[PDB]
DNA sequence: TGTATCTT
DNA sequence: AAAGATAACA
């Protein structure tokens, strides 16, 4: 079915044979059979399809997917045309235009162009029941996305991790703070953006850190 | 009504 | 665990 990127499957397929993951996917399937679950099944792992795992430079970690129709498509905070940017993404764009002087609102919500540059656009929980934020927490996704973070922590060098919100910040303990850069702030949702996201300057700080590590910076305007 | 984080 | 409070801004 070509839903998992090859390089990701190579390093993460060990999780597929573990009971927690088997039982997790059974739970999601039972949810789909009685409720609407987002994103659609072929888009749960879009974040594996945008770049090689060895080419990841930045990890943006959010909480869980958008819970409204036609919004989530497997890249955190992104929406496919023609759906308008949800409030969280409008807040991201709004921080981008104060933080990055060249950034202007791109007129859509598809962040695939960041992912193609090596920005991993991950959520801690990768499915959600329609209309109920974080309804699929504590079911097994956190152990899977822990394995993602742990692989990058151990096999990469000089990554920038942006942990947005309390649930994403639970991954901080798994990251070697002397070998990677961890920036943390509040979630960009309107319900929390006022607790630090506006003013966090994570996008310029990310490029500063990449620069100093001798890596190419993210062109936040490309997407 | 719609989109987190804290307290009990 | 979860209801309700707190929070801000359409
Ligand atoms: Na297990
Ligand atoms: Na479904
Ligand atoms: Na999403």
The label of the residue with tokens 């497997």 reads: A74
CA distance A26 to A28: 5
- Give chain A's length: 223
What kind and span of H or E run contains A62? strand A58-62
Give me A177's structure tokens: 């703070």
Residue A77 CA, ligand 3 centroid: distance in Å: 4
Q: Does the CB of A16 sit below 7 A from strand C?
A: no
Ion ligand 1 contact residues with beta carbon within 5 A: A 18-20
Q: Which fold has domain A6-212?
A: Uracil-DNA Glycosylase, subunit E (3.40.470)
Residue A63 CA, ligand 3 centroid: distance in Å: 9
Give me A34's structure tokens: 């009685």
CA distance A155 to A170: 20
CA angle A132, A135, A137 (to 5 degrees): 150
| Beta strand pairing call for A119-123 and A181-185 | unpaired
The label of the residue with tokens 């920005």 reads: A119
| Beta strand pairing call for A128-129 and A119-123 | unpaired
Query: Under the phi-then-psi rule, with left for phi > 0, alpha for psi from -120 to 50, and beta for the rest, what region is A95?
Result: alpha
Give me A78's structure tokens: 């992104």
DSSP-assigned letter for residue A119: E
What kind and span of H or E run contains A29? helix A19-34
- Say which experimental method was used: X-ray
> Burial letters for A189-221: b for 16+ Cβ neighbours within 10 Å, e otherwise?
beebbeeebbebebbbebbebbeeeebebbebe
Give me A208's structure tokens: 């500063």
CA distance A110 to A122: 14
Give every CB contact of residue A158 below 8 A, 6+ residues apart in sequence.
A179, A180, A181, A209, A210, A213, A215
> Binding residue per annotation — A11?
no
The resolution, in angstroms to one decimal, equals: 1.7
Q: Is A64 a catalytic residue?
A: yes
Question: Phi then psi for A160, rounded to 5 degrees?
Answer: -105, 120
């Amino acid at each position: 079915s070509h839903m998992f990127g090859e390089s990701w499957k190579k390093h993460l397929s060990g999780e597929f044979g573990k009971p927690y993951f088997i039982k997790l996917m059974g739970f999601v399937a039972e949810e789909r059979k009685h409720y609407t679950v987002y994103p659609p099944p072929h888009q749960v792992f879009t974040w594996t399809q945008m770049c090689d795992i060895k080419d990841v430079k930045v990890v943006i970690l959010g909480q869980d997917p958008y819970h409204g129709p036609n919004q989530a498509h497997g890249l955190c905070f992104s929406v496919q045309r023609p759906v308008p940017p949800p409030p969280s993404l409008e807040n991201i764009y709004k921080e981008l235009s104060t933080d990055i002087e060249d950034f202007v609102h791109p007129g859509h919500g598809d962040l695939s162009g960041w992912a193609k540059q090596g920005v991993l656009l991950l959520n801690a929980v990768l499915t959600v029941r329609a209309h109920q934020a974080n309804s699929h927490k504590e079911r097994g996704w956190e152990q899977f996305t822990d394995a993602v973070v742990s692989w990058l922590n151990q096999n990469s060098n000089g990554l920038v991790f942006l942990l947005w919100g309390s649930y994403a910040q639970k991954k901080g303990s798994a990251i070697d703070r002397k070998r990677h850069h961890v920036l943390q702030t509040a979630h960009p949702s309107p319900l929390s953006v006022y607790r630090g996201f506006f003013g966090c300057r994570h996008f310029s700080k990310t490029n500063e850190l990449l620069q100093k590590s001798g890596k190419k910076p993210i062109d936040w305007k490309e997407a």
